[PDB]
Amino acid sequence: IPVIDGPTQILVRDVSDTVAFVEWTPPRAKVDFILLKYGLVGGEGGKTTFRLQPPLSQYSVQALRPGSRYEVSISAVRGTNESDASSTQFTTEIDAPKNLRVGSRTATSLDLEWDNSEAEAQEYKVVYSTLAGEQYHEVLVPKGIGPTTKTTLTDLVPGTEYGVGISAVMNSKQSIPATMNARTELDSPRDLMVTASSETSISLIWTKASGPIDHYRITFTPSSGISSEVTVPRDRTSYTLTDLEPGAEYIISITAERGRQQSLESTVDAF
């Protein structure tokens, strides 16, 4: 039976992933210090106690485990007499995954990897879009086994910048997303080949590159250093070279350009 009264009506008004703002109304009468106790609800626990000065009707508790359930209590001591404790429970928010990176880039895919959250998350919500800010795609990625989780985004548009947000998910609860950006490669034309191979001209075919480009660029080199260039619009899938040496044994490269980006090369020879 507590001789003396103490602080009451404890409140946890705001909580991030590692921090809680605790609030209470002070004791009516004299008290020489206040006790704030907190710890995990999960038996394998133990409490932290701070002894605070009587003026304070609030305190910020720090370095808490994310996605975990805590008990917090507040009481007063005067001489050898502890008061009743006002107690409440609360749950820290789920922490966002850390260290997002891109591995393999191609024209239509990005490989993502991130560190798993300290909190238990069965799944990760991966939300993405071009930076043009059209409607986002969404994808639930089961948690990887190790310290890390990977996924690959597919069917992306070549040569474009994506924004990605990854959130840890347990129950209906979500962490805020962690963000990063990445650029897909520009797609390359493939299978550029000879159609005609005459003494003055070479009529080339080639497998069209994919997604938005501006134009193709064919460079043609016969002698050691001297190399010339031509341009060809998007629409086209074949060109004819016209000014050349007689049966000169070339080797010819084609490439797609959009803005400041160019794609990897393709090549065949002509005699």
């Binding site: 043009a132 924004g163 963000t179 990063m180």
Partner: protein, 126 residues
Amino acid sequence: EQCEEGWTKFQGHCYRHFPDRETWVDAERRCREQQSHLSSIVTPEEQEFVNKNAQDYQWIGLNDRTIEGDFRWSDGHSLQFEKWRPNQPDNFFATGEDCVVMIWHERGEWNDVPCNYQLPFTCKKG
């Protein structure tokens, strides 16, 4: 005053596109090492030139980092011309969506995005 090595002149100011990808704060911090600021865009003609000179997604100096929703140029210029993408700005991601990118293939229209993204940028001084 005339135009330095690596810069190019447009309607009174000098400009330089840097292809190296940096966060918005680092891009602005780079610009300031050269007595410059991430570019502000005050007329359509400046839009068209800064877009056309870069031809890439890039940071400009518009941001709402100090007061959410209130976009300001890093160089103190008043906001009198805007060229936003449909439905932007939207503060999509609650963490740090406060910095503005020029979407080059869409007439160079602007989207607010996470400041932690790494992107090329253009600097501008007189």
